[PDB]
Symmetry: D4
Subunit: 201 residues, 8 copies
């Protein structure tokens, strides 16, 4: 798990606008995955499963980081902005605030670099809890390798900050909850979309 | 639009089982699209849009054809079978019958070849009605090229059958309706999945 | 299956206003059907079935064509207009746009004539996928006759445009989807009509 | 408004089976209406409106009468039977009992003839309460003519039975309520039809 | 069934306001019933059943008649008025219009007297279709007596108007439908009452 | 407030069966109320209001007491029984158990007499919290008179039991909750009654 | 069961604001309970059960009393106010009025002291109807002790008012109903909270 | 922030059974919190907020660990067992499997000790993402202290296992998701509880 090969993979890459943005990102997510050290060696079936389970947390981590320099807002993969106001107006205010508060702003205060982001992603990607994996222990092994390199990296680049490694990992539960919330809102809009119901709201 | 280029793209590639099957197929759908003659030259944004709008009709056409030699059933991209009985038992009986009646059996009686399938796919892929396309006329142009080559092909290989070209095109509306129905059932199961409600049925 | 006999059948003939319009059209739909070449020879039971399955696509095609010269709007069978604005205000904006974009405007650019419209209708009428038909192959035969005459007609009147026949057929899937959408909205309004709920919206 | 001409109009003509039955009957309802004395002279718009408002009461009166000689059941316009048992099993037990109790059996005890049935129908057809009629007073006039001839007829053929005329009219409110109930069940089945929900039931 | 004893019984007697009004009327409905000729002789159980089945049609007939001299409105048993405007604003516009159009205005044009009203009431009261009556034939007999006296009365007081009797009876189906509608709205308001839901609307 | 006047008023008087039972009881509830000391002197409007707010608690108290000698069951005002088993089978098990546990059995252990029951009733009847009362303090005054006589009575007949008066009053909150629950179940059954949904359970 | 020990337990201690207020109060509710005379001696299991069943009535009684000197409003345990206006604006108007009318204002007119409040609380706490109590009679015994001391206290401090004891107890049913209502609204807000639905309202 | 004091706090302490179990645990949760090093020094308001946000994850971690020696099941705080079978039968199968798979079994394979459990708990308790905290940075500081001691402890007791610390933290996202799922099921059961709906299930 050379952390360098991971950083390389990263570099290698309102509701209507946000969903199209997510789309653009999904269009090349398999490409990104294929760049992570041993992902390609996992059974093809284990690969789809890992991606199916982590796609939105992954994306939520990507756009969050990319938005570190946006004034109370998010920077879509599409180039457009979405600010706290539009989000509230669109009915996705509460979760949008979680994004800024729990992910964006906190990734900004730590000055979380790409290498670190990629790792967190790589980690969420190698999720042993993914249902139906052929060999879970295998997957487990690949993630402990990632956070091993990751902890090392953090010790090298940020020796003054000894608790950064943990601190980084502690952003994963926030990505977990936000993600579940994301999918819930996604259902809703998908359910009321293009029906007179939507015109209402 | 060389029809051979298309055929090459094709060759290049119960509810829980069916969804995992669809997943496996989505994992490489972009790859398939990238093999169609001029798809890659369309703006990236127009590419995601075309795929978002045609993914399930596309997949429904693929598994339908692949199932031509299955006794009252479907042959998943996963290798497993799903027969009319399991489908009814799973609550997806009515649409499952549409698949066999309107797509599978009719693709079987015509002895619809891969070249022809790929074209129909290529056609659904180049859908000018896709919302948000930058250059729609451009997309329109690419599909009329596909069905031009397609009609030619049909004239060459099946001269005795002069109405086959139309006959082929007339399977598209069935894919349209079945597809919409598919997504509806997909919502439902996605909606009650992993909830005590699912235990109920 | 002379195309002339079909053209003669054609010639032979906001939500509250739209529904009353649809009504006026249903009042004589059987008459129109009875004018199509061999429709009357099909078992009576097969006749009701064909009409039950195609009534709204049929009507949607009729009013769409009739609206070719309306500024961003639809020309009801009642003489009244309904413009993009009223539709959005009424909550049927999204589908109304599909009508104008996918049907009206595209029928207008092609300068789709009555003879061609009638055929498309005749074709949707002879739908072999109609559930419960006694003799499906019989119905299949009648539609391939229609599109045979239709392709011929298109070759005669528009020799310069060799792809027009296909192009015409490719409007059927749009009528399929729009139609299903239509029925869905119809349920909704039928469900909240004359109830305090409708007042609230 | 001769009762004879009415009688002539009449003579002139489980849930899946019942609905197809209703369909068969709708296929020629306009024909039946066109045979009633002055219906054809009413504005075309007033004609559609009258049929839209009375179609199911009308049909419910037709099949009820037709079922006078059926053992605890209904005789569909399709020839098939539906017995109290199938109806209960299908979830339409309560209203089905109203049909037999309030309409069928009571039409059977009175030995209600076709002439009388036709009139009741003609009466429901000329409904001044129909929303949107151009000239309601005109419609009102046509119905009082019908029940005028009807009362006369009843005095002629059944002199010993002086209260029969009223007795007949008093079956109209039962047709009204049953009809509204019918449409409600119709929504429900149309709403859960061909969806996994249906399979559950 | 002396019609006089009936008239005697009659003489003997916005949503929040309307319901309290209905209440006031229910408080003495048994009293009114007890005044109808043979009602008291029917088994006590048959009496509750008749009242349970006819209470709202009865009341709807009472307030409708009482409102004959109100400008586009209803005169509650409470003395207060409710005009077409408040009703629409309250979400009960559609049914409120049926009341005025189908009942009030039509009772006004005929100059329907109390004696006639009472009879219609007495008639709805003696409803043989009431579920669970011990002796229905008995009830049937009492209603044919009422409309016998009623027809006689109409012949005496209004000899020039020979069709008035029928005309009167023909208002019963309108009371039937309006009544069912009434109960439906009643459920709704009872369902959303005193919940933040109501504050909304 | 003579307690004897009250006792005199009292003496003066599965889901389908239970509701018909409640009906029988409502048929004469006004009569019972009119027998309570000063109820008749309250404005008529205040009378309907008190009855509207207390009808089910009142009835629930009546049938509960009447059921003191029933083996795990309730004795309807109709003479029929309903036992813990039928209730559970009917879906009203939980509340039915509250009736037996909180009301019946506890009224049985205390050997709660009619005089005491009537009072509790009289008390619930004179409810100052009833919304819309003209003179609330007046109503308040009448209930404190009732429980004054009540406490006296309890001191006279049961001198050994000094806490019985309180104990009696402490059964009112149980009648309050059970009552609200009752109305809720009543909505539900009223909501799915006579619909295929009811056939379902 | 000295009333003094209870008074000492008491002394010992817009929707978003109200819920946080309730929270603050729950944070120390067990502490309060542990201060009531024999509560701690009851099986631990019986203790949780009593608190689970009475927590909101208890809290509702606490904040109501604490609000005796607030102009048409409530004084949260948080120090903040919530006035009749904010409540209506928040959709909790109806129940909020019940609080002021049935609890606050009435506790204010009686000049209900802390000792008396505590008792009422202690009483609701020792609720024998609590489902699953191991020894119910035990609990029953503890509440009759409370209202025994309470009645005594009321006789001592307020000899001129002999009906005060009853009067106090008669506030319990109002706390029962208001409480059930409270929980219902609580579900609703908990159900639509942080969802686009809450935004819309 | 000595891990010892944490360990000491820990030591210091089917759906109907599970909820009563959760209850028993809530009854003393504040006590447990008060034992964590600096929790008591945080503003009282910050204390309630932290507990409100972490109560179920906390409990879910407690019962999970406690269940390490249960054959395919959970060991309630009540002493009772709940096995995979009862859970599925109760409709909570899917989440129950997540508990065993993601928490129980994985806590069992690592041989996760109490000291480590307590820490994870202490960590979830000091959640800076808790909405409405007065001083979040303060809370953040307390959690980094906990995982600092925790990492140290893990290095001391398990020197051969260098990745255990991370491995432990990586169980937090699973607790997050499971927790959200838990609350969702909790709503559902609370919503259909004690209603005929419950009896159906
Ligand atoms: C689709 C989607 C929808 C939403 C969100 C996130 C996404 C995701 C995503 C990921 C990446 C990008 C991008 O890079 O531009 C855009 N979107 C899919 C996770 C949040 C959380 C903002 C709440 C608002 C809604 C509308 C519910
Ligand atoms: C996901 C999906 C779900 C369903 C269907 C089709 C798919 C699709 C798909 C595509 C490809 C493959 C494959 O290659 O095996 C399998 N499935 C996505 C279109 C049908 C229509 C069978 C109805 C039953 C349900 C369960 C609703
Ligand atoms: C009833 C109906 C309702 C609607 C539509 C079409 C019809 C149909 C129809 C048929 C014929 C005519 C006419 O001749 O004027 C008009 N309408 C029945 C198909 C569209 C698609 C406009 C979406 C808006 C809604 C309100 C959902
Ligand atoms: C469509 C329809 C559906 C239903 C009914 C009646 C009809 C109607 C009808 C009319 C005519 C014929 C016939 O001639 O055979 C049959 N049915 C339309 C009125 C009843 C009342 C039986 C309740 C059961 C359901 C399933 C709800
Ligand atoms: C309760 C009730 C509610 C409603 C109506 C009628 C009544 C009834 C009634 C009868 C008599 C009186 C009176 O004499 O004042 C008042 N109300 C019960 C029939 C109509 C139809 C106006 C629709 C509006 C709503 C609010 C649905
Ligand atoms: C109508 C009603 C329905 C129900 C109940 C009580 C009544 C009431 C009542 C009053 C009196 C009598 C009688 O005298 O026999 C019978 N019932 C109206 C209060 C309980 C609580 C048993 C729950 C079961 C359901 C079906 C929900
Ligand atoms: C949570 C809660 C919500 C609500 C209420 C009461 C509470 C409770 C409570 C307890 C204590 C305190 C306090 O000390 O300030 C405040 N509130 C929990 C009972 C009322 C009745 C005001 C209706 C409005 C809603 C929003 C439904
Ligand atoms: C209340 C609750 C309900 C449920 C669960 C967990 C709890 C919680 C809990 C905590 C502690 C204990 C105990 O110590 O025995 C038991 N349960 C509250 C988290 C799971 C996850 C099993 C899903 C099944 C349902 C029924 C939805
Ligand atoms: Cl911007
Ligand atoms: Cl048969
Ligand atoms: Cl006025
Ligand atoms: Cl066990
Ligand atoms: Ni910006
Ligand atoms: Ni097979
Ligand atoms: Ni115009
Ligand atoms: Ni038969
Ligand atoms: Ni007025
Ligand atoms: Ni018995
Ligand atoms: Ni204030
Ligand atoms: Ni066990």
């Amino acid at each position: 798990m050379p952390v360098d090969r991971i950083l390389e993979a990263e570099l290698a890459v309102p509701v209507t606008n946000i969903c199209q943005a997510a789309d653009k990102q999904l269009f090349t997510l398999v490409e990104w995955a294929k760049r992570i050290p041993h992902f390609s060696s996992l059974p093809l079936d284990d690969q789809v499963i890992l991606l199916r389970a982590g796609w939105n947390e992954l994306l939520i981590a990507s756009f969050s980081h990319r938005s570190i320099d946006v004034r109370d807002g998010i920077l879509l993969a599409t180039g457009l902005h979405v600010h706290r106001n539009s989000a509230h107006s669109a009915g996705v205010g509460a979760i949008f605030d979680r994004v800024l508060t729990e992910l964006v702003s906190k990734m900004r205060d730590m000055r979380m670099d790409k290498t670190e982001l990629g790792c967190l992603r790589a980690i969420i990607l190698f999720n042993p809890d993914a249902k139906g994996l052929s060999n879970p222990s295998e997957v487990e092994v690949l993630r402990e390798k990632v956070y091993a390199s990751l902890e090392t990296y953090c010790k090298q680049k940020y020796p003054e900050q000894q608790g950064r490694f943990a601190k980084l990992l502690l952003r994963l539960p926030a990505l977990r909850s936000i993600g579940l919330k994301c999918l819930e809102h996604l259902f809703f809009f998908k359910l009321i979309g293009d029906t007179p119901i939507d015109t209402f709201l």
